[PDB]
Symmetry: D2
């Protein structure tokens, strides 16, 4: 086709039609991929959201903190894709940090229970998904997670940044595992995307200073980006994930591709 | 004196006389610092170990996973150092990863409960200690944590590497907090040191392949290091921590100083 | 088509049929691109080499140290591609370092005249080519240079590594310029490829220790690479350049994509 | 004493009393070091400037582009420090980029002759000085160069940033050489310092947009720096160089210490 013609790809992390995973899924479908989707807690909602995708995809429940969901995932996917068949692609687009780890709520006041939850979902689950899914991936396969660059501290994202640092680190280790399968594991570091949760935050859900910082981060991003950054458009990030899902970056693993407008390559 | 003449410095993480913190404490004492030590669970043992230090230091209990130890730490330190007095320096030299996160035990088989424990102790506690201690630190003060470079995946260290990635990320955030106090926060990335736990590992405590990898990592380190690396000597790392504790790196925060022989600057 | 269907792409740096640029050109042609090739000094040779490409491409002379070649390049390319037409893609695959900057010839003994020549060709020419070609590139266009990771020093590559460090730095600046055109500028950091010059070096052209180091670097690469590294195969690198030439990494500029088997993400 | 008590240290790069090298020299003298200074072209001027140093230091001429100055340097230094004696420390604080490589003068318009000059002086000379001086350095010795972080492109500094990227790369290679002598080689990445040339630039010497960018870079620096950044104060950078010159960072080579207020650890 079709960048992804005839690849079977699992895509997690659709929750709204503004989810980065929603766009990745749409772009993957436009590109010939046959999807299986996961979806966390509100599966009726996600089913309804994902009905709007160019094509039908079976939707499986996966709460990444649920050991049983992870244990059964894979059997459930091979059931969805047919017993002879394996996955070519896996998209991790899962993230969460309790808002204590995120606010104008001081960095220091996030209880470990909360940061731990955040890291479980946002970092450890990348290894979890890979563990569940590598047994049902084809050689030449590709696992992609969603990242943002946590190299430098920043306002507001707080423990979520730490979670991303941990994720990038996890990604290099899953690369080692994925490699024994002929599978690549990479992260896409996106710039900020006005996802519903993000709009809620710039809109003041987590306090005014958190919103103000974030708005500041967004403007600076587009300014630093040599090709600009449009936070209202997930598609350049969806496409980048698809590029990683494709056979066109075959020698790249344990790695991070920056779909951020080049902002991170630029101080000012 | 005395690099650290008249600085009050808290040093955590002494457990044996081969602890990096033991050397840091010794070097800090030789350098004029007045120490308060923390010590986790075996305080009789640590007291006996620390008796061998050039000078007396009060030893306080601090289990970094214990909220109450953290809540009372600070009052306990100002009690140890005298009500008029604040800390100039804090050494975090705390690390742990349950051995499921460390073995030939596959990376994928570490339960999150265990990696979470590891991250609590090895990463989050850096923010914990800083939160507890910044209220009782002087402007010009310095928080230093022990790191190793988690930029690239490696054999055996597994989730502990992820924990370090998370720590480095935490360190940049505590820098932001520490800065409001005039306090620096930095990490020292050491090369491998034949600490008791490390010797136990190269000796096969965590399986033979884990020991073999680790021994390999050690030899390659000294080979890559343009000035060599002696894993039996913590003192160049103790000295580096002291350099960070001193006023001689006054414009360095949120940062990592590599006391690793320059190995990380060298591919081969 | 065709990852690159209907893109006009200039590809420099073909000198043998084992040139990375040769493979990039072949892969680009297989992918629907219409090429213009440049070629430095031995144009009869290059023409004969490039005859073996899936398709015809006009071959233009470009000595990147020749101001006049650069001044006329662009007019010559629009002549080759037709007056209405612009470039969508530019491949810099040019490198050279006089062997004084490369040997067992001590790092210190390379005269500046030689390292300067190397940097002119290997780094500065990336800005040169971009300067010449950006006026005749389409929005959505892509400039790609060939890199190897110079983050850490290494044996044998010496001043060539410095040249790559300078190149990566140049690349971030050309990104800033390229961006005003809607053009991306990125580098591909390849692992070692047994190009004729490289085989000559491991074979002892530059002394035995240089060959031995290099062979060592190669073996370690494939070992560190979670998906392996085949130094006899440029195609995963050709494909990665094509991925950058494509519209599939639209939010990536000033950046470096590692087509190296993930080796750089791995210490050991 | 005296961080640097009884160390013989060569310090290059004094040109005004606002030179970073001037402060390094002053701080080194306050710290017990016995200096030899180099000085490029205006030696009467430099002698007069350096008379203001806490102590006398012999001033030697060293034009780093002059092969003969480099060939004779070392004999001239051992003459200045006495035949039995070697250097413990070498400070490279040399930089220059012709203003074509620096302006609102487009990045693309800097002729290679000029960038080459800049790199000769700003990067290659680090290897030059090390080559000249390592034969007359003691084991445990320390070479330190002045850097600024060229990881990300920035406005105005243009080719000078490329020069720094090349310098950092050179530094890792001189580490390899320096190591055979027991000598460390490290760079200090300073934040912006209102040196005479820098004030001239923010004041509009190189065009208004270059000044405006630079002023912007300065303000953002102090904002990002968790401990702030005072561009009018070189002393935290002088002290950091001294820390590297000292025995207190004995396991750090091929490395870069950021004396920048922690700004580089912080996105915003
Ligand atoms: N701006 C952004 O939206 C942004 C998003 N991402 C990543 O993109 C991925 C998708 O996020 P999104 O589309 O923004 O947000 P979303 O809320 O649409 O998706 C998050 C998904 O995670 C799912 N999830 C939460 N908990 C669980 C669980 N227990 N089990 C299974 N699934 C669960 C949830 O159902 C939802 O579908 C996440 O990893 C993000 O962190 C990465 C980077 C950025 C961008 O944050 C950014 C750029 C620069 N600095 C900071 C941030
Ligand atoms: N080789 C090493 O020994 C090494 C050690 N460090 C760090 O140095 C620090 C000190 O470790 P060490 O001296 O090796 O080991 P240690 O066992 O002497 O000290 C660890 C300390 O942590 C303490 N601790 C554990 N749990 C708790 C708790 N709940 N509350 C309070 N304290 C607790 C424990 O009591 C002990 O004192 C740790 O952060 C290490 O991770 C950092 C890097 C390296 C080196 O690992 C390295 C280099 C390159 N690649 C991998 C590793
Ligand atoms: N192994 C490799 O072959 C390798 C090659 N590259 C880059 O790939 C690009 C193509 O190199 P190649 O295919 O290996 O070698 P090649 O000799 O086939 O191509 C070099 C080209 O540069 C051209 N050239 C030289 N001087 C001029 C000039 N004045 N004007 C115009 N053109 C000129 C020359 O004609 C030739 O076509 C160069 O930038 C390389 O540096 C990048 C990385 C690696 C790999 O070096 C690597 C990986 C890890 N560590 C070290 C090295
Ligand atoms: N702001 C700054 O002043 C700054 C300065 N440095 C480095 O500090 C070092 C000293 O520079 P300075 O004190 O700013 O400037 P300066 O003009 O006082 O010193 C430069 C010295 O180089 C000497 N020099 C020039 N040509 C030659 C030659 N052929 N042979 C021998 N010596 C020669 C010259 O005599 C002068 O003494 C240089 O390497 C700088 O690049 C490094 C970083 C920064 C800072 O630029 C910075 C921070 C963030 N982004 C960008 C810049």
């Amino acid at each position: 086709t079709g960048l992804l013609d005839g690849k079977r790809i699992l895509v997690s992390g659709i929750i709204t039609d503004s989810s980065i995973a929603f766009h990745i899924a749409r772009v993957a479908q436009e590109q010939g991929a046959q999807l299986v989707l996961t979806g966390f807690d509100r599966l009726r909602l996600i089913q309804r959201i994902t009905d709007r995708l160019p094509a039908k995809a079976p939707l499986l429940e996966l709460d990444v903190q649920n050991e049983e969901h992870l244990a059964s995932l894979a059997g459930r996917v091979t059931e969805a894709i047919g017993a002879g068949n394996k996955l070519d692609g896996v998209v991790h687009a899962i993230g969460f940090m309790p808002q204590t780890g995120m606010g104008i709520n001081p960095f220091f006041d996030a209880p470990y229970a909360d940061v731990s939850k955040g890291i479980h979902i946002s970092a450890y689950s990348y290894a979890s998904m890979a563990k569940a899914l590598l047994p049902i991936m084809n050689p030449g396969g590709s696992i992609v997670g969603m990242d943002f660059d946590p190299s430098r501290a920043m306002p507001a994202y707080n423990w979520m940044t730490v979670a991303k640092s941990a994720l990038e680190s996890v990604n290099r280790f899953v690369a080692r595992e994925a490699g024994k399968y002929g599978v690549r594991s990479n992260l896409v570091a996106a710039g900020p995307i006005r996802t519903l949760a993000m709009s809620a935050i710039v809109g003041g859900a987590l306090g005014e200073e958190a919103g103000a910082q974030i708005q500041l981060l967004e403007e600076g991003w587009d300014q630093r980006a040599p090709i600009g950054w449009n936070m209202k458009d997930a598609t350049p990030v969806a496409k980048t994930v698809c590029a990683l899902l494709s056979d066109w970056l075959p020698a790249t693993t344990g790695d991070i591709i920056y779909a951020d407008g080049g902002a991170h390559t630029q101080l000012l």
